[PDB]
Enzyme design. Sequence first.
Site, mmCIF file in Angstrom:
data_model
loop_
_atom_site.group_PDB
_atom_site.id
_atom_site.type_symbol
_atom_site.label_atom_id
_atom_site.label_comp_id
_atom_site.label_asym_id
_atom_site.label_seq_id
_atom_site.Cartn_x
_atom_site.Cartn_y
_atom_site.Cartn_z
ATOM 1 C CB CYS A 114 -0.944 0.032 1.206
ATOM 2 S SG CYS A 114 -1.995 1.508 1.247
ATOM 3 N NE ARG A 117 2.271 0.593 3.656
ATOM 4 C CZ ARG A 117 3.437 -0.031 3.773
ATOM 5 N NH1 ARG A 117 3.804 -0.575 4.930
ATOM 6 N NH2 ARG A 117 4.240 -0.103 2.720
ATOM 7 C CD1 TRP A 286 -7.044 9.296 -1.712
ATOM 8 C CD2 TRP A 286 -8.125 9.465 0.249
ATOM 9 N NE1 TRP A 286 -6.147 9.754 -0.780
ATOM 10 C CE2 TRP A 286 -6.782 9.870 0.433
ATOM 11 C CE3 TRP A 286 -8.998 9.491 1.345
ATOM 12 C CZ2 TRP A 286 -6.288 10.287 1.671
ATOM 13 C CZ3 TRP A 286 -8.508 9.907 2.579
ATOM 14 C CH2 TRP A 286 -7.165 10.300 2.729
ATOM 15 C CD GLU A 291 -5.755 2.504 -6.719
ATOM 16 O OE1 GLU A 291 -6.201 1.419 -6.281
ATOM 17 O OE2 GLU A 291 -5.885 3.603 -6.116
#
Lengths: 416, 410
Positions: A114, A117, A286, A291
């Site tokens: 991720c 973070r 969000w 992506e």
Amino acid sequence: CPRFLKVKNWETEVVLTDTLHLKSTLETGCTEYICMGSIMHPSPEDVATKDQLFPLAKEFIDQYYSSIKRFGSKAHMERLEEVNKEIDTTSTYQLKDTELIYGAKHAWRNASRCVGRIQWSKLQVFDARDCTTAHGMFNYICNHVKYATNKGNLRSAITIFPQRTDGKHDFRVWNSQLIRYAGYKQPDGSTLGDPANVQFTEICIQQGWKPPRGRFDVLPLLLQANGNDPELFQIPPELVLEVPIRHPKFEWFKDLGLKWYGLPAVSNMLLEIGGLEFSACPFSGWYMGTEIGVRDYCDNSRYNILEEVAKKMNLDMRKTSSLWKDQALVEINIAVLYSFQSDKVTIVDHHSATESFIKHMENEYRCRGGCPADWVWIVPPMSGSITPVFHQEMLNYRLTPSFEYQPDPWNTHVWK
Amino acid sequence: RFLKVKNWETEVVLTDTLHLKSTLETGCTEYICMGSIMHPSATKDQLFPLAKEFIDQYYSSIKRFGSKAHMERLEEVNKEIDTTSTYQLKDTELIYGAKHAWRNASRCVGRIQWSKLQVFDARDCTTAHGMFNYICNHVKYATNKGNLRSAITIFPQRTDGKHDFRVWNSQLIRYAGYKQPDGSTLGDPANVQFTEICIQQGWKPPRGRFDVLPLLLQANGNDPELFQIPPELVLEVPIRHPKFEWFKDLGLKWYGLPAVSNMLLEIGGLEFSACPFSGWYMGTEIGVRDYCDNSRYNILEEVAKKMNLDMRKTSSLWKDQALVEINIAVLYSFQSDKVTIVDHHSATESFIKHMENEYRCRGGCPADWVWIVPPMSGSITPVFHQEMLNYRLTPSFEYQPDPWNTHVWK
Ligand code: HEM
Ligand code: HEM
Ligand SMILES: Cc1cc(N)nc(CCc2cc(CC[C@H]3CCCN3C)cc(F)c2F)c1
Ligand SMILES: Cc1cc(N)nc(CCc2cc(CC[C@H]3CCCN3C)cc(F)c2F)c1
Ligand SMILES: C[C@H](O)[C@H](O)[C@H]1CNc2nc(N)[nH]c(=O)c2N1
Ligand SMILES: C[C@H](O)[C@H](O)[C@H]1CNc2nc(N)[nH]c(=O)c2N1
Ligand SMILES: [Zn+2]
């Protein structure tokens, strides 16, 4: 293992020192002779025995009381004893609300894949462990969606359903994400909508869903409580925030008819806290623009729009070395960021996100002694080396609490 | 411990058996993966098993394993290690080992070409002048008036560590970088230190932006010596753009020949500390990394300026936009000058085909995803979606200390 491991950033020469890897709890898949760092899923119906559970719970309780600067205290020792008694008489135990919140935030903090973070401590945790039915799960998820969406000012959140007991009474969200578009295989072999979701879409239709058979149909929720057969629910459309995609320069870009949903919400992962297993723990943040703009739109097996956009840009598409694909991919990601920002829907470009992540990682090294990171996932899918994470050496290892993958529920479910 | 690798775009699954043959370490352990670390952490006794392993796979490769020739070679190698603490490869072995070090380079996306490698045996070389001559011949052969050909020149192997042959240049052809008074940097900032060693050793720098560096060559562990590659041997390309006529006015150029000169080639336990090798460029090497890394030529702001892009917010993706046009220019320029170059789309496509070839005929292909995936447009190339297993096979190309950190100046 050695006590201090160094990582270098090759653009800035900054060297960081990792001691946190000594707390590594699970295996990565790698060995001394092979590295499996680009394997997506490196290597049941089986619950933790009493003896497997005791040390896993102690390790977590110890970590929690260390975090609140009460390690070794009377409350720490008493909590250990009460947990031990609970495991002894019931072969499981129940987390305190404080412990659940801490564990959830730390599973995010520990999620090596991720890039977002830096936000880990700002997570709204919704305790849904009192849920007993699919209708109740629907209610909890709707409240989650509404809270996290927040009219476009998105807020990260997790809703945690009851933990696994014997493995025959699991809570599951059968959807892989709360909000996704249906995909429909045609007789002629073509696909309408999102080709990634053809299998799940077929499952929903078999379960009773009447499909609009459009390009952007939000899928229903398929929700399993207490190991029962899952049940269908339609998310109230007013809770699904969506953004039509337009381009700041190309007036024709709206003519493509593209849009996307605002809320990324993963619902198929397993949350592991102190040896307890929360098989239904949907969490949402969000989007980073790529992506949607690189993967969702431009993956060959997804919406696959590079050709159509290149055509409208009047690019030479005969030679790959004209880089027509690359040129169109940029414009598509410009449109995505521009459409989300215009509608005041939280989104983050890949430059800002990776810069934030370097700052987060440096802070974690200073304050925590490391920050597990999966470079293969952290580096964005476009323009990799002009983002700061490309040049950053990372160390990957598995800390607990953690989010894990788990088998798809239609592969394991025993139909009643 | 058959390992499977999946392509998530095509769903092709390949089965890896070849990893069972590795014995060097990767740096990972079961608990910590170091896949993104760029550099994770002989005698007669160590040397014979390593030699025997290499002779074995050589004779296995020409399908004469256990043959009379194979048995004789093993004994010949045994006595030679006995009486001299080392041994010398046959010409056939030298060529086999060099192709196979390229074949095994997990970080090279160009390995579909691996068996078309011209191997120059320079093991009779004794002086820096001889090294210079061998290197000029390599450059001229490999350049070939634009029709680039892969080549490697192999200088004498390490003996006691005190008589090492080294090319001190990291690559045969590079541009100088100069630390400016006002703090900035003229030329290539990656080379500022090497440029300063050349200046210290007597090189008269022209102090321009694309000054080809001289060769600094060390033979038999002696002090290195300077040589100017004859300019007619250094092929260069002015970079211009098919649509932006202002692009040529940026004044950019690059050399045609990528040639790594600072690595160590290991073959059957022998260490070849000077083995310059060269191929042809993938466009992104110049256009993304060389030109746009912040610590390199760092031209993005200038190009985005001439493109009149909105540079006030990162979310305009002005950097990404300029990056593509620069890489269009590089490909267009080399192609217009009939200088061999490959774009990252064609190259990664070839590598997927190479992987398929290798799994079928060899049972696997070690590959480092971190290095194989191009530094731009990653997931619209097929290697982004290809799972890879990384493992270390020998013969190999290894890193080694920079010579200025070890050399005792005589
Ligand atoms: C708040 C803003 C967030 C941003 C910008 C962000 C960004 C990202 C991105 C770009 C990925 C890669 C996803 C992909 O390529 O499929 C990812 C993965 C991941 N994120 Fe975050 N994320 C955010 C919030 C969260 C939250 C709230 C959690 C959990 C509480 C979380 C946990 C994870 C996990 C576990 C993964 C790995 C998923 C997998 O392996 O499939 N993230 N994130
Ligand atoms: C023929 C065309 C070739 C192409 C298109 C090509 C492409 C590439 C690229 C793009 C890289 C990454 C380099 C970097 O990012 O610095 C690389 C690495 C590498 N290549 Fe190839 N290459 C070619 C030929 C060769 C040859 C002839 C050899 C040796 C015989 C070779 C051995 C290597 C090695 C050892 C590396 C790793 C270097 C390192 O770890 O820094 N390559 N190649
Ligand atoms: C909390 C959070 C924040 C954030 N910015 N992104 C995410 C991931 C969002 C996400 C993930 C996936 C799975 C992709 C998997 C399946 C196929 C290939 N990938 C491995 C699908 C989606 F629709 C989706 F929205 C979560
Ligand atoms: C045979 C072959 C073919 C091919 N297309 N490319 C190569 C590599 C070319 C290459 C590599 C470097 C080192 C870059 C450094 C900087 C920091 C990290 N990297 C290790 C400098 C150069 F000038 C150069 F040309 C070799
Ligand atoms: C930290 C990381 O290992 C480093 O930046 C790597 C990443 N991938 C790379 N990939 C290639 N081809 N070349 C490189 O120099 C690098 N650098
Ligand atoms: C094979 C490879 O591991 C796979 O394509 C990975 C690469 N990196 C990724 N990185 C992110 N963020 N998301 C992904 O789905 C992937 N896919
Ligand atoms: Zn590894």
